[PDB]
Structure 1
Amino acid sequence: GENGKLNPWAVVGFIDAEGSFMVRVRKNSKYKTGWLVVAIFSVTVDKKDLFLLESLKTFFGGLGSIKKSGNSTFSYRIESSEQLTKIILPFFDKYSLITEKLGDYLLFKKVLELMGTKEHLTQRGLEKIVSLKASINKGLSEELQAAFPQCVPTPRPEINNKLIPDPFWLAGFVSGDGSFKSILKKSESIKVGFQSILVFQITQHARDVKLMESLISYLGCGFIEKDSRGPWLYYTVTNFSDIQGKIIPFFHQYKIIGSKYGDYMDWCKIALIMQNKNHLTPEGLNEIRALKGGMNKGRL
Structure 2
Amino acid sequence: GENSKLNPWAVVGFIDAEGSFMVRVRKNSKYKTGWLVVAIFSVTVDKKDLFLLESLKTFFGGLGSIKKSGNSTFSYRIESSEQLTKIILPFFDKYSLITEKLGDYLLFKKVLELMGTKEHLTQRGLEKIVSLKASINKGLSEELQAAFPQCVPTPRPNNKNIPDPFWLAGFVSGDGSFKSILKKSESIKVGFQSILVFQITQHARDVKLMESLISYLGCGFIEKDSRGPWLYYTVTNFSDIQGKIIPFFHQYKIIGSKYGDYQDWCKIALIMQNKNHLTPEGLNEIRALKGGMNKGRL
SS of residue paired to 1:116: coil
TM-score with structure 1 setting the length? 0.97
Q: CA deviation at 1:16?
A: 0.5
- Cα deviation, 1:180-214, whole Å, max 9, x if unaligned, reads 01101111111111110000000001111001100
SS of residue paired to 2:180: strand
Say if 2:5 and 2:59, in contact at 8 Å, map to a contact too. Answer: no
Say if 2:3 and 2:55, in contact at 8 Å, map to a contact too. Answer: no
Distance 2:240 2:146 in 1: 54
- Cα deviation, 1:110-130, whole Å, max 9, x if unaligned, reads 000000000000011111101
Say if 1:5 and 1:257, in contact at 8 Å, map to a contact too. Answer: no
Say if 2:2 and 2:55, in contact at 8 Å, map to a contact too. Answer: no
Say if 2:39 and 2:81, in contact at 8 Å, map to a contact too. Answer: yes
Q: CA deviation at 1:228?
A: 1.0
Q: CA deviation at 1:80?
A: 0.6
Closer, same or farther: CA 100–49 of 1 in aligned 2, 3 Å: same
Say if 1:2 and 1:261, in contact at 8 Å, map to a contact too. Answer: no
Distance 1:4 1:217 in 2: 31
- Residue 85 of structure 2 is matched in structure 1 by 85
- Cα deviation, 1:239-279, whole Å, max 9, x if unaligned, reads 00000000000000101011111110000000000000000
Distance 1:285 1:241 in 2: 19
Say if 1:4 and 1:258, in contact at 8 Å, map to a contact too. Answer: no
Distance 1:171 1:66 in 2: 23
Distance 2:171 2:281 in 1: 35
Say if 1:2 and 1:257, in contact at 8 Å, map to a contact too. Answer: no
Closer, same or farther: CA 172–286 of 1 in aligned 2, 3 Å: same
Q: CA deviation at 1:48?
A: 0.7
Identity %: 99
Q: CA deviation at 1:5?
A: 4.1
Q: CA deviation at 1:149?
A: 2.3
How many residues end up aligned between the 2 structures? 298
SS of residue paired to 1:41: strand
Say if 2:3 and 2:54, in contact at 8 Å, map to a contact too. Answer: no
Say if 1:3 and 1:261, in contact at 8 Å, map to a contact too. Answer: no
SS of residue paired to 2:75: strand
Q: CA deviation at 1:161?
A: 3.9
Q: CA deviation at 1:141?
A: 1.9
Distance 2:3 2:249 in 1: 12
Say if 1:4 and 1:55, in contact at 8 Å, map to a contact too. Answer: yes
Q: CA deviation at 1:90?
A: 0.5
Distance 1:169 1:284 in 2: 35
Closer, same or farther: CA 212–4 of 1 in aligned 2, 3 Å: farther
Distance 1:150 1:259 in 2: 46
Distance 1:2 1:37 in 2: 32
Q: Which runs of 5+ in 1 are unaligned?
A: none
Q: CA deviation at 1:3?
A: 11
Q: CA deviation at 1:298?
A: 1.3
Say yes or no: does 1:116 pair with 2:92: no
- Cα deviation, 1:61-102, whole Å, max 9, x if unaligned, reads 111111111111101000111011111001001111111111
Closer, same or farther: CA 5–184 of 1 in aligned 2, 3 Å: farther
SS of residue paired to 2:96: coil
TM-score with structure 2 setting the length? 0.98
SS of residue paired to 1:243: helix
Say if 2:49 and 2:256, in contact at 8 Å, map to a contact too. Answer: yes
